[PDB]
Design an enzyme around this catalytic site. Structure first.
Site, PDB file in Angstrom:
ATOM      1  N   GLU A 179       0.824  -1.236   0.000  1.00  0.00           N
ATOM      2  CA  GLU A 179       0.000   0.000   0.000  1.00  0.00           C
ATOM      3  C   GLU A 179       0.855   1.283   0.000  1.00  0.00           C
ATOM      4  OE1 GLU A 179      -3.053   0.499  -0.402  1.00  0.00           O
ATOM      5  OE2 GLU A 179      -4.065  -1.413  -0.049  1.00  0.00           O
ATOM      6  N   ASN A 181      -7.667   9.511  -5.320  1.00  0.00           N
ATOM      7  CA  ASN A 181      -8.504   8.634  -6.144  1.00  0.00           C
ATOM      8  C   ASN A 181      -9.422   9.416  -7.094  1.00  0.00           C
ATOM      9  OD1 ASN A 181      -8.827   7.070  -2.976  1.00  0.00           O
ATOM     10  ND2 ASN A 181      -7.592   6.363  -4.674  1.00  0.00           N
ATOM     11  N   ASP A 228     -12.620   9.424  -7.430  1.00  0.00           N
ATOM     12  CA  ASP A 228     -13.823   9.975  -6.807  1.00  0.00           C
ATOM     13  C   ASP A 228     -13.525  11.212  -5.959  1.00  0.00           C
ATOM     14  OD1 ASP A 228     -12.600   9.008  -4.497  1.00  0.00           O
ATOM     15  OD2 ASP A 228     -14.210   7.643  -3.946  1.00  0.00           O
ATOM     16  N   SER A 235     -11.513  11.301  -3.309  1.00  0.00           N
ATOM     17  CA  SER A 235     -11.039  10.946  -1.963  1.00  0.00           C
ATOM     18  C   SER A 235      -9.519  10.786  -2.020  1.00  0.00           C
ATOM     19  CB  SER A 235     -11.738   9.633  -1.477  1.00  0.00           C
ATOM     20  OG  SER A 235     -11.265   8.536  -2.303  1.00  0.00           O
ATOM     21  N   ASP A 285      -6.107   8.590  -0.116  1.00  0.00           N
ATOM     22  CA  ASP A 285      -5.690   7.499   0.808  1.00  0.00           C
ATOM     23  C   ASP A 285      -4.457   7.978   1.566  1.00  0.00           C
ATOM     24  OD1 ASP A 285      -7.651   5.793  -0.309  1.00  0.00           O
ATOM     25  OD2 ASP A 285      -6.227   4.822  -1.602  1.00  0.00           O
TER      26      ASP A 285
END
Ligand SMILES: [Cl-]
Ligand code: NA
Length: 129
Positions: A35, A46, A48, A50, A52
């Protein structure tokens, strides 16, 4: 901070992740590696809108607040910035909430595609635990 493989393992074990909801330590170290490459400061945006954050790439759509993800939730009750700290406590505590929500570690795409079904025990092999 960029963790060493064994260093992170020991950190995660101390925070109660080994065997948490049945997932052996190896699973968590494997997830973190793919990750974030063990980098607490990793961020990725991302499609959309958002983002991480952190060692476990926790998503701002549901788990933390970054002030720029309209109509999102903050289920971990923390600013996303707190997930980038050198102290993994915040990320660990939030990940515990995520893995308990019903989908287990499948919530981590990298874990599902690169750790699940593999010899995850290899990620803590040789470590003084
Ligand atoms: Cl599960
Ligand atoms: Na949010």
């Amino acid at each position: 901070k960029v963790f060493g493989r064994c260093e992170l393992a020991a950190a995660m074990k101390r925070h109660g992740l080994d065997n948490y909801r049945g997932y052996s330590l190896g699973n968590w170290v494997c997830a973190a590696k793919f990750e974030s490459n063990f980098n607490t400061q990793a961020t990725n945006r991302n499609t959309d809108g958002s983002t991480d954050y952190g060692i476990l790439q926790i998503n701002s759509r549901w788990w933390c607040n970054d002030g720029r993800t309209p109509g999102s939730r903050n289920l971990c009750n923390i600013p996303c910035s707190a997930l980038l700290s050198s102290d993994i406590t915040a990320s660990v505590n939030c990940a515990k909430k995520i893995v308990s929500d019903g989908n287990g570690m499948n919530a981590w795409v990298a874990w599902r595609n690169r750790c699940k079904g593999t010899d995850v025990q290899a990620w803590i092999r040789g470590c003084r635990l």
